[PDB]
Amino acid sequence: TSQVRQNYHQDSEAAINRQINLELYASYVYLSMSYYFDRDDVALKNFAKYFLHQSHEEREHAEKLMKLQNQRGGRIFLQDIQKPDEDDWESGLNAMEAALHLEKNVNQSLLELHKLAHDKNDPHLADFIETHYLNEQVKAIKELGDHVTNLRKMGAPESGLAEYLFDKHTLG
């Protein structure tokens, strides 16, 4: 037992390890997306920049959980980072839809983590999730839904003009 460990259930410890993996997986998905937009035959630089920024943020989300595991006296066990479900993301609209889906899945995992923490009477962990993760997810999900809406309204993905103008005016 770690000398710092206090009120920290082993189940919380394991669930943190799984969340770390999931944030690193979200990072990788966004990385993939980013360089899809950099292809010469896609060529939407601001979509690329947008997803690259996202990739870096997800890495940060993972690192703060790793710091938390050590803070609480848990032990980090890393697992493979799975490659994303696609190589080719099809269009700006499709990538934004896939990111929306992803952020809702990350959010469901976090809500389950909070439920676990409250079930184990770990208010430090429950508040950590509340403070640093839950509203961030809500904002990410809203922003992505806003982006989906606009791209749809504009005529994406059929309108190549729609995606070009969105890239310039919303993401740029």
Residues 32-51 close enough to bind a copy of itself by CB under 8 A: 32, 35-36, 38-43
Instruction: Give the one residue of 13, 17, 23, 68 binding Zn ion; rule: CB under 5 A.
Output: 23
Measured from the CB atom, the residue of 9 and 107 that comes closer to a copy of itself is: 107
d(CA 162, CA 156): 6
Residue 127 binds Zn ion, judged by CB under 5 A: yes
Footprint of a copy of itself on residues 113-142 (CB under 8 A)?
Answer: 114-115, 118, 121, 123-124, 126-131, 134-135, 137-139, 141-142
Measured from the CB atom, the residue of 11 and 77 that comes closer to a copy of itself is: 77
Measured from the CB atom, the residue of 19 and 69 that comes closer to a copy of itself is: 69
Binding-residue total with a copy of itself (CB under 8 A): 83
Task: Choose among a copy of itself, Zn ion, none what residue 61 binds, the Cβ cut-off being 5 to 8 Å by kind.
Answer: Zn ion
Question: Does the bond joining 157 to the residue before it have cis omega, within 30 degrees of 0?
Answer: yes
- DSSP annotation string for 103-160: HHHHHHHHHHHHHHHHHTT-HHHHHHHIIIIIHHHHHHHHHHHHHHHHHHHTTTTT-H
Instruction: Give the one residue of 9, 57, 64, 81 binding a copy of itself; rule: CB under 8 A.
Output: 81
Measured from the CB atom, the residue of 21 and 91 that comes closer to Zn ion is: 21
> Smallest distance from the beta carbon of 104 to Zn ion, in angstroms?
8
**C-alpha atoms less than 13 angstroms from C-alpha of 67 in its C-beta half-sphere:** 8
Task: Name, in order, each residue with C-beta under 8 angstroms of 73's C-beta and a sequence gap of 6 or more.
Answer: 1, 2, 3, 4, 5, 6, 8
CA-wise closest residue to 80 among 124, 18, 127: 18
The helix (run of H) or strand (run of E) holding residue 43 is none
Residue 14 binds a copy of itself, judged by CB under 8 A: no
Known binding-site residue numbers for Fe cation: 23, 58, 61, 103, 137
